[PDB]
Design a protein around this nucleic acid. Structure first.
Ligand SMILES: [Zn+2]
Ligand SMILES: [Zn+2]
Ligand SMILES: [Zn+2]
Ligand SMILES: [Zn+2]
Lengths: 56, 61, 156, 129, 89, 226, 196
RNA sequence: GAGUGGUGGCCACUAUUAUUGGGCCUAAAGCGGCCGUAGCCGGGCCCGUAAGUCCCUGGCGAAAUCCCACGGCUCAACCGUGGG
RNA sequence: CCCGGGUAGUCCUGGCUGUAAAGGAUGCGGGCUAGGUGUCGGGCGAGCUUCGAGCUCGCCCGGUGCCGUAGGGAAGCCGUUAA
């Protein structure tokens, strides 16, 4: 049993072959932000769980 | 769009020029507002906000 | 949308959520009742009375005042008029529709070729019939009451 | 004109969830809608919700947790007995005990599982999953 | 209405010529030395009736449902198809 | 361990060209579950050869459709072969692909390569009323998938029930590892390409359904390998 | 107003946008002038520049990619690349660079930077397909779709682009530690500017 | 396989009768357009009745037929005893 | 078909006929689902003005076009004026 990534903005799961992305938070540097395809297209803001900094 | 619609017109406390009476009038009148004492016009109705011809002391909510 | 034109005009009134009259109201319940009866004697309709009170006397509305004679209901222009024995004999909107229908028929008698005005008259009469049905159901007028173009002149 | 505020609310919830809205506003407000939202919150399909007065029927503010796949009212409100729930489950849900069939019963509105546990029927007023 | 007519106890395949089913049934018939395909289809129908009973009872609630579950398990154990500690699964 | 030694040989005499290929070769990635849900692009069949070496078995390789297409020219007819094929392991992982060629063999090779490139990961389980077991023998719950005009709905079925679907979907599900299912199809199912792609999309859509933590236990949900 | 003086920002004209607007950029929009032109927010620009520098300092320099097809943006991108060590592709972006392994200059960066989404639609599409973070110099008319880090700036003016890229390079170097302090940066701003 | 073929009829195939559960821009299909009678569908809150709805409990809806367990014709078809 | 004439008709008054590619080939009322850009009417704010019922910019409501994201469709294309 392996953990499955979850989008940071909408909280939905990430499918195997969607244009999703993940990167270290640009503000703190320890949290990992995941963005799913739909959130990325819709340009929905994400808020870091650690910093509270918000952006797209 | 707004969840709770809020009026964009206010009630104005005004001073009559001719006699100096205090009055409270609507800022979007559909008639010609007249002073209750001297019968002098105070606000001119129009398509929207009226034209006030008397001094405006206060703008109540 | 509109009843017949099927348009979506949204112009109207946006009153703030209130439960008690604002403090800055100068007049009291009895004074506003006297003002309402005075305006009715002057000869205005209910809507025009309310508009005059809102514009000149700075009374946002009489519906914000609780009825002194009935704690279970708020005040109202029609209720005040009927309390003082001055309410319309028949509904004011129905009266206005009947009046303008009679005027339109008078014009059509001189201009029989005005088919567009005739269609307008037909729509007015449909609205009149709707109102008559509603008031029949609510018992606001005799059950045998019927709208007659001939008899409407007497009412007008 | 407006016919079913509950159906309007559920359709709006589904539409906004499909685009990932975090917050929704339900207008007009009704006690049936409030109870349905309470059941959904109990089962963990929605977040916090509150009632707002506006001089009218009222409004509801609701938070979405990105958990609803599909929610919709059931019409006509079919009456259902205690022993006649499997067919409705098969009709409206993908798998057994997957979603919740919101049912109005003589003892208030509750999930169909709660209705089965209490041994009572009612009318099927909505479904969520 | 109509009176009772004694129906067949075995079922015929939905399609008479499918390669996979033909090969599988040929293997079974060669191994077990059956005279005709209707014997194999009768045994298949017996199996399918057992599975249908199990499926119907799994999603059933009631005293008669429990009695039928116990009776089915007992009958299978008596036939010798299941171990003494088997369950409805 | 023939497939294991095949994977070792590929990893030995393979020269990665892409970022994911470099990851696999250096060893940053060891299990196939790592290359999914990350946005990486799979453009080298050697990655699939290394991570799922059993997909090269003939039993695991299935050719679905072979069609002849014609182009008109002032000279005459230009014939081409379109091959729709599917590969995968009979546990969680399946892929579908299309290839074109002047020859059937070339078309088959290209289709197999593209299916390997398009391999995906699915979820299995049991969510039927008549089974209520906890094994990955069927789909966890009802799913839908459409391609063109064909709409396919897959529904869980009791254990031991065959694959109640067309031949194309049956083969796709058998390669994907599903063993029992019920089907409902609308549209032109005779269009083999569209039918296969609809079945593939339905299988893929098992990852688009939100589930609760207890549902995994309830339905015996298994992701990828079991 | 910390990395550079607000007077320098205004002189470079980084706060001059375009006649159009977008709801995505509504937050970054400062106000609208009476001629119809929208002006961005220098404070938000500064904060986003700091955040972008911090984010890019974490990536290994050779894996950062910068793209600009605009003539006035080519030179700043080249200077930024040659300073930070990041790869730069001014001018046309040959399709298949990231998606086709058979291309001569095939490359798979870890983070991409676009001078302008609309101009670099091809690069943004390639980045979306590849699956790596994107930083975009966005104007008022731009769309924040598929943009993982937006820098509100005038992505058309020569001076604005030169100043933005100079500030970004200095920030990345300072965060990476190759320079003890911002004052250790010796390269002049004028070099980033395109010759006219 | 002691059966196997031909012809007519019914159901499935057929989501080509669509309550579950079909379509109406270009393939069959939106009245040329409006107003209105019956019918169908109907905004929010409070209280009363239990008609509809749900639960429980008496009297019913013959037998044969249908499903299950056991027992008797060798097992079976068939019958008998109990439960549904 | 081209050219020179030509009756009914085309026109007005009072009636009948009820037919069109009467086509947005798309029935009507209600709620929801990214944006961008023209134009018409009204209202609001700001800046000019030769003070004009004048000009420019932004916002709300209602009409009328184009491009277009999620999604839809066999596709053409539709996409808050939804198909
Ligand atoms: Zn998301
Ligand atoms: Zn952070
Ligand atoms: Zn006065
Ligand atoms: Zn099972």
């Amino acid at each position: 049993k392996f953990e499955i990534p979850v989008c940071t903005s909408c909280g939905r799961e990430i499918t195997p072959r969607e244009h999703a992305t993940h990167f270290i938070c640009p503000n703190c540097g320890e949290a990992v932000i995941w963005r799913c395809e739909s959130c990325r297209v819709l340009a929905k803001p994400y808020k870091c769980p650690n910093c509270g900094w918000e952006g797209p | 769009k707004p969840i709770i619609p809020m009026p964009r017109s206010r009630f104005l406390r005004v001073k009559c020029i001719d006699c100096g009476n205090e009055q409270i009038v609507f800022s979007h009148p559909a008639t010609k507002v007249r002073c209750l004492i001297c019968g002098a016009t105070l606000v001119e109705p129009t398509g929207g906000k009226g034209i006030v011809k008397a001094k405006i002391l206060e703008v109540l909510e | 949308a509109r009843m017949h034109a099927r348009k979506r005009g949204k112009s109207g009134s946006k009153r703030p959520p209130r439960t008690a009259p604002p403090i800055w109201v100068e007049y009291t319940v009895e004074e506003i009742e006297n003002l309402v009866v005075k305006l009715r004697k002057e000869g205005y309709s209910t809507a025009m009375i309310g508009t005059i009170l809102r514009d000149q006397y700075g009374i946002p509305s009489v519906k914000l005042f609780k009825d002194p004679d009935n704690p279970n209901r708020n005040l109202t222009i029609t209720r005040i008029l009927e309390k003082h024995g001055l309410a319309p004999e028949i509904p004011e909107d129905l009266m206005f529709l009947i009046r303008r229908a009679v005027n339109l028929r008078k014009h059509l008698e001189q201009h029989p070729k005005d088919l567009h005005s005739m269609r307008g008259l037909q729509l007015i009469e449909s609205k009149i019939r709707r109102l008559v049905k509603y008031y029949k159901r609510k018992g606001k007028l005799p059950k045998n009451w019927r709208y007659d173009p001939e008899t409407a002149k007497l009412l007008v | 004109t407006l016919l079913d505020p509950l159906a309007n609310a559920l359709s709006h919830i589904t539409n906004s969830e499909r685009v990932g809205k975090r917050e929704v506003y339900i207008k007009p407000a009704s006690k049936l809608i409030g109870e349905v939202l309470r059941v959904m919150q109990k089962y963990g399909y929605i977040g916090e919700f509150e009632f707002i007065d506006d001089g009218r029927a009222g409004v509801y503010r609701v938070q979405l947790l990105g958990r609803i796949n599909k929610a919709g009212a059931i019409k006509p409100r079919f009456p259902v007995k205690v022993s006649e729930f499997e067919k409705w489950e098969k009709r409206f849900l993908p798998a057994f005990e997957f979603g919740i069939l919101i049912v109005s019963t003589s003892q208030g509105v509750m999930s169909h599982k709660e209705a089965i546990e209490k041994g009572i029927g009612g009318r099927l007023i909505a479904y969520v999953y | 209405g109509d009176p009772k007519r004694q129906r067949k106890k075995y079922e015929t395949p939905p399609h008479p010529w499918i390669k996979e089913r033909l090969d599988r049934e040929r293997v079974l018939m060669d191994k077990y030395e059956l005279k005709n395909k209707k014997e194999l289809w009768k045994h298949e129908t017996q199996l399918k009736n057992f599975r249908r009973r199990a499926r119907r009872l799994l999603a059933a609630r009631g005293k008669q449902a429990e009695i039928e579950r116990e009776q089915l398990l007992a009958r299978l154990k008596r036939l010798g198809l299941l171990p003494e500690d088997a369950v409805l699964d | 361990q023939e497939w294991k030694e095949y994977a070792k040989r590929v990893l030995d005499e393979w020269e990665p060209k892409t970022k994911l290929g470099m990851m696999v070769k250096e060893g940053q990635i060891t299990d196939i579950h790592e290359i999914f849900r990350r946005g990486y692009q799979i453009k080298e069949p050697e990655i699939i050869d290394v991570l799922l070496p059993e997909v090269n078995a003939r039993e695991n390789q299935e050719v679905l459709d072979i069609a002849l297409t014609v182009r008109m020219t002032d000279s005459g007819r230009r014939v081409r072969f379109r091959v729709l094929a599917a590969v995968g392991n009979r546990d969680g992982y399946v892929g579908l692909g299309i290839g074109h060629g002047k020859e059937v063999g070339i078309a088959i090779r290209k289709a197999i390569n593209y299916a390997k490139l398009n391999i995906i990961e699915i979820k299995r389980g049991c969510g039927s009323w008549e089974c209520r077991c906890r094994r990955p023998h069927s789909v966890p719950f009802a799913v839908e998938g459409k391609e063109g005009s064909v709409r396919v709905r897959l529904i869980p079925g009791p254990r031991g029930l065959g694959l109640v679907i067309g031949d194309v979907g049956k083969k796709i599900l058998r390669l994907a590892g599903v063993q029992d299912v019920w089907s409902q199809t609308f549209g032109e199912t005779r269009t083999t390409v569209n039918f296969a792609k609809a079945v593939f999309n339905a299988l893929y859509n098992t990852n688009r359904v939100a589930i609760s933590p207890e549902m995994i236990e309830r339905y015996g949900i298994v992701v990828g390998r079991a | 107003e910390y990395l550079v003086p607000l007077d320098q920002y205004l002189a470079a004209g980084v706060h001059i946008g375009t006649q159009q607007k977008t709801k995505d950029m509504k937050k970054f929009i400062y106000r609208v002038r009476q001629d119809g032109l929208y002006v961005l927010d220098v404070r938000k620009t500064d904060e986003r520049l700091k955040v972008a520098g911090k984010f890019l300092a974490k990536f290994e320099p050779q894996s950062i990619l910068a793209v600009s097809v605009r003539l006035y943006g080519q030179k700043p991108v080249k200077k930024f690349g040659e300073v930070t060590g990041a790869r730069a592709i001014p001018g046309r972006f040959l399709p298949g660079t990231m998606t086709n392994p058979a291309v001569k200059n095939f490359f798979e960066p870890d983070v991409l930077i676009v001078t302008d989404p609309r101009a670099d639609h091809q690069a943004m599409r390639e980045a979306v397909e590849i699956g790596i973070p994107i930083v975009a110099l966005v104007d008022t008319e731009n769309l924040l779709s598929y943009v993982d880090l937006a820098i509100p700036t005038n992505n058309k003016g020569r001076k604005a682009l030169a100043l933005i890229y100079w500030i970004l390079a200095r920030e990345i170097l300072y965060n990476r530690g190759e320079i003890q302090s911002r004052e250790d940066f010796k390269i002049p701003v004028e070099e980033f500017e395109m010759k006219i």
